[PDB]
Amino acid sequence: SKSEALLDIPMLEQYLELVGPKLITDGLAVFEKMMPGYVSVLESNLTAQDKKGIVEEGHKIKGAAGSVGLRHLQQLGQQIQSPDLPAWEDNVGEWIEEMKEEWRHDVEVLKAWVAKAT
């Protein structure tokens, strides 16, 4: 059930048919190199209590993750960039830490899925 929950399987299956696995795996390699810096910027903005900085970085990750089918990371970045939500002030530091702790795992789950599908 982890593949279904963390990845966008319909999008990935259509992508495999249209482009093949190489564009997905190359995109994923770029995502892995940029994510350490994206999460560090989220954290430094959280410390500075810079709301615009946090929302801007959330939006960048949302797009980045959605491009490679990381549906749950995309949903976290959607929540991070949504200060209109009643729970935002209470939970944005929790969603930041959740992202920090899990993104490498979510990348390993997509790598395995692409390996099995191909």
Sites of contact with Zn ion (CB under 5 A): 98, 102
- Quote the least distance from Cβ 80 to Zn ion, whole Å: 12
- Residue 58 sits at the vertex; the CA angle it makes with 54 and 64, to the nearest 5 degrees, is 150
Which residue lies nearer to Zn ion by CB, 50 or 108? 108
- Quote the least distance from Cβ 73 to Zn ion, whole Å: 8
- Cα(114)–Cα(118) distance, rounded to whole angstroms? 6
Which residue lies nearer to Zn ion by CB, 15 or 77? 77
Which residue lies nearer to Zn ion by CB, 16 or 78? 78
- Cα(88)–Cα(78) distance, rounded to whole angstroms? 11
- Quote the least distance from Cβ 87 to Zn ion, whole Å: 15
Q: Could you identify the residue written with the tokens 């549906």?
A: 71
Q: Could you identify the residue written with the tokens 């797009």?
A: 63
- Quote the least distance from Cβ 72 to Zn ion, whole Å: 5
Which residue lies nearer to Zn ion by CB, 24 or 72? 72
Cβ(39)–Cβ(104) below 8 Å: no
- Which pair of tokens denotes residue 6? 């963390």
